Amino acid sequence: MIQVYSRHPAENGKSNFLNCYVSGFHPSDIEVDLLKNGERIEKVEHSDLSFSKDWSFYLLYYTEFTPTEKDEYACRVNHVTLSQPKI
Amino acid sequence: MIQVYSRHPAENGKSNFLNCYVSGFHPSDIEVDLLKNGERIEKVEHSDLSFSKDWSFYLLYYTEFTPTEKDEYACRVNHVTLSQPKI
Amino acid sequence: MIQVYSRHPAENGKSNFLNCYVSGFHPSDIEVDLLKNGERIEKVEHSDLSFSKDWSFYLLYYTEFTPTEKDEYACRVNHVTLSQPKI
Amino acid sequence: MIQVYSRHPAENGKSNFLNCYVSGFHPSDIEVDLLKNGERIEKVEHSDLSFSKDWSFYLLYYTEFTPTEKDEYACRVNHVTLSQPKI
Amino acid sequence: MIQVYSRHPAENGKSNFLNCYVSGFHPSDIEVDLLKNGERIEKVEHSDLSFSKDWSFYLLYYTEFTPTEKDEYACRVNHVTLSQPKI
Amino acid sequence: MIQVYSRHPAENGKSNFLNCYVSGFHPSDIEVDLLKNGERIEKVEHSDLSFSKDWSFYLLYYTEFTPTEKDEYACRVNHVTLSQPKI
């Protein structure tokens, strides 16, 4: 007998907002599961749940890397109000 | 006997809004599952749930990488109000 | 007999907001699990849950790395108010 | 995996022979069985294998029991030979 | 894994022979069994294997028991030979 | 893993032979068993294997027991030979 009681009442402005510049590897809210709720299981073999192997931002082989850039970031944010009254 | 009680009452402005620039690898809200609720299972073999293997933002072989760019980011946000009254 | 009582009532502005510049490897809110709730399980073998192997920001082989850049970061944030009254 | 190896090579003159007088309750070679060889059985309920309840040779109610008998037992057995050579 | 190796090579003149007089309750070679060989059985309830309840040779109620008998037992046995050579 | 090796090579003239008079309660060679060989059994309840309850040779209620008997036992046994050579 397994009983699970999961509650997530409220979320306000969870993630990734009001950003001038976002880049790169940013996966979010990803759920990978096997036999999350299991009862009376004889066997389970050869399970592979590897998310990734190698993280390399710059991987160059016999390369000539010459980027020229002049980037100006001038984002403006005014009067942002977040309210979560709870009674 | 397995009993699950999952509640998600409210979400307001979850993700990825009011952004000047978004790029790259950003998958979201992805669910991959096998036998999430299982009862009286004899066996389960050779399960592969690998999400990915290799993350490489720049992967170059015998390359001449010469990008010239002049990018100006001038986004403006005014009077953003988020309200979640709860009584 | 397994009983689980998990509660997450409230979240306000969780992560990654009001940022001038975000880059790199930043995955978030990722859950990988195997047999999270298990009862009367005879055996489980050969489980692999490796998230990653190698983290290398700069990985170069026989490379000439000559980037020229003049980047100016001038983001402005005014009058940000976060309120979470609880009664 | 259940393996049963039952051998009964030889029987010679098993029972109830060369008898002058046999009477009464003598049942023989009676086998009563339920699920003699069973594998992976979830449940089994309300099994009744009672052979008998009450043994009463003389059961009399308000009876007048007056038997007169003159019985002579004069059986003769000569030169009975039992041979079971085993090589 | 259950392995049973039962051997009964030889029996010679097992029981109840060359008897002048046999009477009463004498059942023989009676086997009553439930789930003799069982593997991976969750439950088994309410099993009744009672052979008998009450043994009463003389059970009389308000009875007049007056038997007259003159019994002579004159059985003769000569030259009984039992041989079981084993080599 | 349960392994049973039972051997009963030889029996010669087991029981109840060459008897002048046999009476009463004499059951023989009776086997009553439940789950003789059992492996990985969760539960077993309410088992009743009572062979008998009460043994009363003379049970009389308000009885007049007046048996008259003149019994003569004159059985004769001559030259009984039992041989079990083992080499």
Residue numbers in the entry:
A (entry chain D), B (entry chain B), C (entry chain F), D (entry chain A), E (entry chain C), F (entry chain E): 6 to 92
Give the original sentences from the paper that presented this experimental model.
β2-microglobulin (β2m) and its truncated variant ΔΝ6 are co-deposited in amyloid fibrils in the joints, causing the disorder dialysis-related amyloidosis (DRA). We show that the aggregation of each variant in vitro results in fibrils that are polymorphic, which contain different numbers of protofilaments and different numbers of β2m subunits per layer of the amyloid fibril structure. High resolution structures, however, show that this polymorphism arises from the assembly of a common building block that is strikingly homogeneous and monomorphic.
Further 3D classification allowed the 2PF fibrils to be separated into two sub-types. A minority of the wider fibrils (13% of all data) are in a different conformation, in which the two protofilaments are arranged ‘tail-to-tail’. However, this polymorph has C2 symmetry, and the two subunits in each molecular layer are thus identical. Notably in this structure the N- and C-termini of each subunit adopt a ‘downwards’ conformation. This blocks the inter-protofilament surface observed in ΔN6-2PFa.
